Structure formats: C-alpha cells, structure tokens
Chain A
C-alpha cells in the first residue's frame, strides 16, 4: 500500500539513526567562521555555526558534526558516558542490582556505533576496551530483558531506562503477545 509492510506500527533502524542524529554534540572546529556565505539552516539553529573559532569547543547537531568530520574540518568531542571509567561504573551498577536497569543515555547504542565508525581516532581511550565494555553491557541487558519477559500481563508493563534500540527490537513481540492476552481476557469477561 502507500506504506510498506515492515514499516507499519513500528520503526526501522535507519529511521532510528535519523532520529538519533537530530541531537546536539560538542566539537572542536578547525576553521574560523566568526567574522572580524554564512549558514542559514531552517530546521536547526545557525548562530553557532556562523560563530565558531578553531580549537574552541562549540555545540552543533550530530548530523552537521559528522558532515564536518567527513571533510576533516572538526574533531568530535566524545561524550562523558563513553569513557572507560564510566563504563566500568555502569557495569558494576548493573551487576549489583539484578532487577533494575542502568541509567545510560537512551541513545547509547546508536551513538556508540556512529562514533566508532566515523570517528575512530578522537577518543582518549583504547577502542577495543570500549567495544568490549559495550558488549558486556549489552549482554547483561539482554539477560535482564529475557528475565523480565516472563511477567507479561493484560494490564500494563514498566521498563524504566531502556534504550530506544532495545525497545525497537522488542516492540513487535511484546506488543503482539500482550494484545493477544488482553483479547483473551476481554473475551472472558
């Protein structure tokens, strides 16, 4: 029909990346846009781009930061959460509590991949260590998700601080099973 079959009542990973790139990020410009043509974007603020000085940190959308990095005109600032120490702290937090979820940013999986691919030499920590820590976090989250799927009911469910990618993963199965259970319960009454 007007919309494909797989795009009905859910999202696609490409659209999730599209959503994630609409957020701001900090970068180190390599040129001097500030005066002693100029950007007039309409969807995003253009004042910051027109006023950038080399080596002075500024804030711009992630999509524009990647576009600048494509030409090698800026250096992206890796967020504070990505650093190793924070990752070990979050892994310990996850291990200590076998019931609750950690409080990582909602875009902690898409941003990780985007930065690991596009910006592989801007981090201040070894890349392999970060990849391993992210893998461990993902595996623990998968375990907890599997354990929590046994409590589906016909009233509601709560998953505090769950990333967008995992919710997208689980949207069809959880929704369909809960809908079937709710239909059975409604028929029973």
Chain B
C-alpha cells in the first residue's frame, strides 16, 4: 500500500522533472543504460525542489526508503529501454553542511550525513549476496530469498520433519555483487 505509493511518487518524480527543456534524469538513465552502466545519480537539491515530502521521507528513514527508490529506478529503466536488467543503484549528491568526523555521535544514528576525510587503507573486493536459492536438507524444498544491502537477512530457521537450520544454499543459481571496505581518517 504505502510502499506502492512511494514507488509511484519516485516514478513520477523521475518521469516528470525538467528544468528548462531537457528531461535531465530520463535522458541520464537512457544514456547510462546504453553503455551498460546500471546506476542513477540524483542531486538532492532537485528532489527537494520537486516535492519536499519525498525528501522528508527519504531523510527520515533512509534504510527503508532507498530500496524503493532503486525499485522505481529499475522499473523506469525497463520502461525506457525494453519495448513492451539488474536492480539499479542510487548515487546521491548533496550540498548540506559537513559534519566533522570527530563530532559524529549517537545523535546521528541512521541518518544521512556528509563528511570529509583522507582515505588511509582499502580492502579487496568481496562478494555479497543479492538472490539466494535455498534447498532443505530433509524434504528438499526449493525456495528463493532476495536480499537488500541496507539494514534498519539470514537463512530461514523453520522449513516452509526438518530441524533447525534445515536450508542449504544452491550456489549455481545465485547472484552476487561486489563490496569493498575503506578506512577514513
């Protein structure tokens, strides 16, 4: 219900925004799709200008709202590119006041913040999960669970007899994404 309304709001924002004569985000999405670049960069200033309620919701609980934005972006991309693709990625640009790194505290837990620093170390690419195929040890029931990176998932403990943790992952029919760890000073 509410999720569908938010998705529709994001879709309308993407499909209707225009500054002077060019649909910025529509053309950007088309160009990115053409070169096999599945991402969209959105300037928060435009989002605030179009409709302040959408930005209010986005800033309130980003971990819950951002995935819906990705879903809307993917739907619009499919509409624009395929005549009647992986889940796209949302990249944000902002011009809000920077919060000093040393000043981050519990007050800013689960909020969008802008800071600056110097990178001192980077790791090697990992392989996170995005779509897992699971089969039960005893009764051999096939199922799939989708995962989103944002946290506000684990293997089922109860089979959908079979004891605790009865599911194992079928790795030949799963999809993964890249991950990296950085350190900021």
Contacts and interface: CB of A to CB of B under 8 A. Distances in A.
Interface of A: 95, 98, 116, 128, 131-132, 135, 139-140, 142-144, 147
A148 to B, nearest CB: 11
A123 B124 CA distance: 59
B153 interface: no
Contact of A139 (B18, B21, B80): B80
A43 to B, nearest CB: 31
* Interface SS, A side: helix
Given A98-B83, A139-B80, A147-B83, A132 B30 contact: no
B15 interface: yes
A98 B81 CA distance: 13
B46 to A, nearest CB: 16
Given A143-B81, A143-B82, 7 more contacts: A95-B84, A128-B18, A131-B18, A132-B15, A135-B26, A142-B30, A143-B83
B176 interface: no
A95 B82 CA distance: 11
Given A135-B23, A139-B30, A144 B15 contact: no
A126 B49 CA distance: 21
B80 A144 contact: no
B16 A132 contact: yes
A92 to B, nearest CB: 11
B120 to A, nearest CB: 45
Contacts of B26: 135, 139
Contacts of A143: 81-83
Interface residues on B, range: 10 to 19
Nearest to A95: B84
Interface in B1-35: 15-16, 18, 21, 23, 26, 30
B139 to A, nearest CB: 44
A95 B15 CA distance: 18
B164 to A, nearest CB: 50
Contacts of B83: 98, 140, 143-144, 147
A169 B36 CA distance: 22
Contacts of A142: 30
A64 B54 CA distance: 47
Interface string B89-123: 00000000000000000000000000000000000
A128 B18 CA distance: 9
Nearest to A142: B30
Contacts of B18: 128, 131
Contacts of B30: 139, 142
Contacts of A132: 15-16
Nearest to A94: B83
Contacts of A140: 83
Contacts of A135: 23, 26
A144 B82 CA distance: 10
Contacts of B80: 139
State the 9 A-B residue pairs at the shortest beta-carbon distance, nearest first: A143-B83, A98-B83, A95-B84, A139-B80, A135-B23, A135-B26, A132-B16, A139-B30, A144-B83
A142 B15 CA distance: 17
A98 B30 CA distance: 19
A98 to B, nearest CB: 5
